Structures are given as structure tokens and as C-alpha cells.
Amino acid sequence: MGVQGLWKLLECSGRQVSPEALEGKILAVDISIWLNQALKGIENPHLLTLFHRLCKLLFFRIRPIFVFDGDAPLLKKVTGQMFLESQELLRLFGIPYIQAPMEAEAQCAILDLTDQTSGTITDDSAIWLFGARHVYRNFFNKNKFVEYYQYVDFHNQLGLDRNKLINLAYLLGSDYTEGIPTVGCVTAMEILNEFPGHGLEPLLKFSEWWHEAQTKVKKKLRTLQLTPGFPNPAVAEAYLKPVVDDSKGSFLWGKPDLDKIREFCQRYFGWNRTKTDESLFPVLKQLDA
């Protein structure tokens, strides 16, 4: 997912934060990535993963907002029952959620930019291209820490802004475009620095020069194979003006309903009161405290 290689390029701006430091923070969560990750990793694994991660989030007293994907963009190349079961569990835990118009990541980004949230929990590097400022990656991985990324930090460290990120998506490949073969981070940044310009002008100049010929960086730059339509401006316009809902929300966090969560866990996982309570009671004692 995301832009090929972008996280490794942003490595220099990553921070190690511990979950306890996120107490009280309102954070958005893209649940579609969870539902796909747990789909391939047991009868209801998506719901089991969702339950354990909800317990982890509420244990650290985070106030999460789950964001579901809507209609996929045409440029972008799993069941509704899973959506419904997930929303049922979220209501049982008292977690607000929203249905994105289209891209969930773009909606998380707009919640960030409108200061309705303190950031987004996701592993999708494409959220930077939608304008995100604060991202929490690898929240549930094998490490004892979450990776934290601030836009301003890698903007200062690397000079990357939204337009340069979109051009990197053109060069490296993303959900919306295939990217140029063999081109990696070093080559793509060489291309973007060789042809300075605002907006998409770097890639327009690069395509113009590659169509023309067909300098010691141009040496290998004119060995790349470019599609006839490169670059497709629909990609940049989808990244720059994604369909989102930028209205101010009215987010409320209710209290978890212990008995209905017991019933849910019994029906979907086969758990009795005791096994469910083993997971719930630390969460509840952290909340009521």
C-alpha cells in the first residue's frame, strides 16, 4: 500500500513513543486496513483483531475515532457483513465512527487538518499525500513502542511537501499509479531535483525532456521507459482535492456495555464470561480510574 519506499525515506523523522504517552488524545483509525490485515492472518479473525486492538486502545485511555472507507476512487486498483459486525462491536464499546465519502485516509487527514483529532493511527504512507500532519505507525507491531511522524519534521529534514510527495507517488508507484520501473527513492529524488518547479511542473519537464531525447544523472534518466500518458494529472488532482467531509463533527465516547460485549464475544468467538472478562476488566479499571 501507500507509496513504494516512502516510509523508509521518512525514517529519519520517525520517533519512538510509548502508548502511555497518548492518554486522552483523540486519534482517528482507518479500520479497512485492519480488516484486510486480519483477513489473511479461526472463524472471525477480523473481529478478534478488532476486539484486542480496541482493548489495547482503551487501556491506554486513547479516545479513538474509527473511519470506514467509502466508494473507492476510480484510479485506485472485505464484505459488508464485516463492516456491520465491526460497527456493532464499536457501538458496544461506545466508540464513535464515521463513514468516509471515499478514501478513509483522506478523511483522517481532513480530521487532522481541521484540528478535530491529534493525528491518525495507520500504516498507509498515502495519508501524507492527503495532507496529514501527525501519524502513528506500527501501533500493534512486535515493538514496545509506536512510531510517530510529524509532517513538519520531515519537511524540515527533507524539504518534502505535499506536491513533492505526489510527484514521488508518480515516480515510485502508489494505489493510483504504477510508477516508473527501476526508479527508487534516490532516482526519484534525483529526477525531482534535476527539474525544479512548482506543482506538477517537475514531472512535466521531465516527461518533456525524456520524450525529446530518447547530464550525468540524465545519463541514466533517459534510460527509463515512460508510458505515453505520463504524467496523468488525474492522479495529482485526486491526491490534492480528494472527496472528504470537512464539517465539524460531534464526536462522543460512551461507556462500554459489559453484558452485551459478553454476548458478542460468546456468539462470535465462543467465549464465556470469564475469558471475555480477562480482556475487559483491565480496560474497565483503566477507564473508571
Residue numbers in the entry: 1 to 41, 50 to 85, 764 to 900, 912 to 986
Sentences from the study reporting this entry:
Nucleotide excision repair (NER) is an essential pathway to remove bulky lesions affecting one strand of DNA. The XP complementation group G (XPG) endonuclease cleaves the damaged DNA strand on the 3′ side of the lesion coordinated with DNA re-synthesis. Here, we report four crystal structures of the human XPG nuclease domain (XPGn) in the absence and presence of DNA. The overall fold exhibits similarities to other flap endonucleases but XPG harbors a dynamic helical arch that is uniquely oriented and defines a gateway.
